[PDB]
């Protein structure tokens, strides 16, 4: 900063947060539920081992991973989640094989005090089944061994083209094989047994399991405990005492000197000239909206994989395009186009903060970065296509294929290329910011914090390394939930708040210090408080008690920093028409209105409805997390990047008219279509399934016996009537930007 002090203080935030990453990966490591060495059966024969568990984990990553269904509730929703259908089916196989050698009959054919005496023998056996003090053994009973090997045949038939199971495979939306080799089936069933055994086993000393008795399961007695509701109400106190103290600290710092700055009659951005490196951004804005159209079309294709079969009113080509591939594409291209629009907006604003001046050979660097981004997208999608089609031996699929985890499934070579592209954009950022801190001035307060936050976003992406493939599941989900604790909570939030502060300072609708306070707030809440909200999702996958104590109180802390609005766009907008050129910026602003609207709809109401764990116990893995994702991601950041897209369209084609009249439809159709496919189809399905999962159980909500009750069948067939409206709105937005590019 003054003597390269502030720029050098960047390493200290990285070091503190990386010590916090190291110390919590250290506790998760070995604080995890253990993979035992070998499955010791009681008769005297051995079973499979950690090599088979690791290779079945790799085979499960090869077939889609969390894009078929889910393990422990995090993932996909149109297939039964492996941890609960296996648990319920293993339980029903055990009751059949326990009624066999005692009565010879079925389960439900017996009376209820007999079912209760077998369930109390079940809780005499399942609440104590461990190793030799993490000694690697099982001591598995032969009755449980015959039950696991009997329910093993079901999943050997679910992926081996069984002709009697077309009533289940496409009804669960898979391709006819999904895994052609037989040892791979034998290892994927061993992996499923381990994940549903680590649920069905109490923790050492305590009476709680390793995943805190994850499904609602009365037949094993999985009722959520006392400290669950205690820490839930503690989290509610933390949420309420966070919002109020932030409003109190905002109100007791809004006491300005009433400066009242006058708005100039022109726009200080358009008064300066245009570099060719600015004029070379039409290709970026084409790639942004091209990937957006690709993403909505793919989304309509997974919509038809949800309602109907794999043939699409003809003959099926889904043998080359399964459900996991189109969901990976929908998920990765969504994150990619949302990130590239903001990356383009940042590289737009970066020379203009520098008085328009540019570094040496800038347009060529912008072009190499552009072709690098298109190359990484196409290679990642080709790797996903080659990996799901089993055109890859199980050795480079982790490196050069679909990795298998939501939002991180890109291959490690393509992840290295994406990290290198983000560092090259970092280079173009420091080449635009440096020249503006080397000048003698007094604006060193906000800009050093902005440098540390941009350095943090990317230099915490060194955490996309430091995990291999052959790792434990929960350690990975600590790291998978570390990614999305910054991939949306970081430079979508913090970058779009500071870019919003730059826009509202240039329009003069902020006091140019509340922007600083907000930026300072949205900076510090994520650089100092960015670690521990991961523990609101890891509490259901391997906590101990001080981990649960930190993760309930210290993970509700991410709710509060969002909205500077309410203090603009109701009074300042009331003071509108001061400047004539605002009629060109009516629509970019409208997006900034809608940004506020789904922030009181996505996270403002449905984010704390689903946050505390006794709420989260019955819903994690149901159709209320996509309710949160769909409303939250396009509802906030899907409008932030198209408002900036629209805004840099009006700043690179100023002579080209923005052609309104259709853009009102493209805006006021997109939001309403998103609200129609969110409030009318997905949320009622989630509440009826939620009522059935608290009534009957978690296994029941994902079964095909329940999802084909012809009410929620017609309600997801009626999902389509808002989706076509959203596609029409997106189509009109796309044609508007293409006609603007001329
Ligand atoms: C309007 C066209 C769209 C369609 C047809 C569509 C389709 C879908 C469907 C069906 C799901 C849930 C799948 C399931 O229940 O298993 C889903 C989830 C999701 N969609 Fe979309 N989508 C669309 C638009 C968008 C947009 C604009 C974004 C953001 C850029 C987006 C990002 C997501 C995300 C992040 C999820 C969460 C998936 C998960 O975590 O399981 N989608 N989409
Ligand atoms: C505004 C920025 C945010 C966005 C864009 C966002 C988006 C998402 C998405 C897409 C998911 C689904 C992850 C998955 O695929 O499994 C998710 C998970 C979740 N979010 Fe957020 N979120 C945000 C902030 C928040 C806030 C502020 C809260 C609560 C205060 C919250 C609570 C949750 C919870 C409890 C889950 C778990 C759902 C699951 O496991 O599927 N999020 N978020
Ligand atoms: Ca998911």
Residue numbers in the entry: 2 to 743
From the reporting publication:
A quinol-dependent nitric oxide reductase (qNOR) plays a critical role in the survival of the bacterium in the human host by combatting the host’s immune response. qNORs belong to the broader family of nitric oxide reductases (NORs). Whilst cNORs are pre­dominantly found in denitrifying organisms as a respiratory enzyme, qNORs are also found in several pathogenic bacteria, including the Gram-negative, human-pathogenic bacterium N. meningitidis, as an enzyme that is responsible for the detoxification of NO produced by the host.
TMIX, which contains two of the three FeB ligands, His537 and His538, is very distorted.
